[PDB]
Scaffold this active site. Structure first.
Site, PDB file in Angstrom:
ATOM      1  N   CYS A  47     -33.568  17.819  -2.007  1.00 63.88           N
ATOM      2  CA  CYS A  47     -32.932  19.180  -1.783  1.00 63.88           C
ATOM      3  C   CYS A  47     -32.717  19.476  -3.640  1.00 63.88           C
ATOM      4  O   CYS A  47     -32.089  18.975  -4.193  1.00 63.88           O
ATOM      5  CB  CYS A  47     -31.654  19.073  -1.497  1.00 63.88           C
ATOM      6  N   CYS A  79     -29.750  20.813  -4.834  1.00 60.51           N
ATOM      7  CA  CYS A  79     -28.493  20.203  -4.338  1.00 60.51           C
ATOM      8  C   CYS A  79     -28.509  19.635  -6.094  1.00 60.51           C
ATOM      9  O   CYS A  79     -27.282  18.784  -6.589  1.00 60.51           O
ATOM     10  CB  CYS A  79     -28.707  19.209  -3.697  1.00 60.51           C
TER      11      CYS A  79
END
Ligand SMILES: [Zn+2]
Length: 142
Positions: A64, A67
Site C-alpha cells: 500500500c 501506508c
C-alpha cells in the site's frame, strides 16, 4: 507478544507486551511515559483494546503506497502524545480475521476505539493535526 518501545527522553529500549488496564507503558530507566506504538495480531487484538486511552488501529500492508507515508505520521503522533494514545499496527497480510471483522476495504484504514467501541474511522491518508485533535478530544474522556 512483546515489542520494543524506545524512550524519547533517555533512549532506553523497553520491551513491553501486555499492559495492565488503568496503566500506560513507562520507561523503566527514567520513568517517562513511552510512545505506545506496536504491532497487533488476530491473537492480541482483544487485549490491545483493553485500555482506557484512545486506541488507534492502523490497518496497513507492504504493497500500500499511502501506508509508507502514514507510518511516520503515526510514529510522530505516539511520540508527541506519549501514554495518551495506543497505536496498534495491524498488517492485513498477516491478520485476516481482524481485517474481515471490521469490514476493511481500503488500505490504509485507521479506526479509533474508546473503551472497546469503535468511535471513528478514517480511510486514506489523514493529516497528523486532525489525528492529534481527535485524540486529545477523546482524552476529554467521552
Ligand atoms: Zn527513559
Amino acid at each position: 507478544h512483546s515489542d520494543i518501545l524506545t524512550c524519547t527522553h533517555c533512549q532506553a529500549k523497553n520491551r513491553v507486551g501486555a499492559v495492565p488496564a488503568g496503566q500506560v507503558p513507562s520507561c523503566a530507566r527514567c520513568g517517562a511515559a513511552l510512545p505506545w506504538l506496536h504491532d497487533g495480531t488476530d491473537a492480541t487484538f482483544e487485549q490491545d483494546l483493553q485500555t482506557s486511552v484512545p486506541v488507534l488501529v492502523d490497518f496497513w500492508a507492504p504493497w500500500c503506497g499511502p501506508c509508507r507515508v502514514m507510518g511516520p505520521v503515526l510514529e510522530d503522533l505516539a511520540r508527541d502524545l506519549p501514554g495518551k494514545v495506543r497505536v496498534v499496527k495491524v498488517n492485513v497480510d498477516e491478520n485476516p480475521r481482524t481485517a474481515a471483522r471490521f469490514e476493511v476495504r481500503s488500505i490504509p484504514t485507521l479506526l479509533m476505539f474508546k473503551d472497546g467501541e469503535e468511535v471513528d474511522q478514517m480511510v486514506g491518508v489523514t493529516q497528523k493535526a486532525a489525528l492529534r485533535a481527535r485524540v486529545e478530544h477523546l482524552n476529554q474522556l467521552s
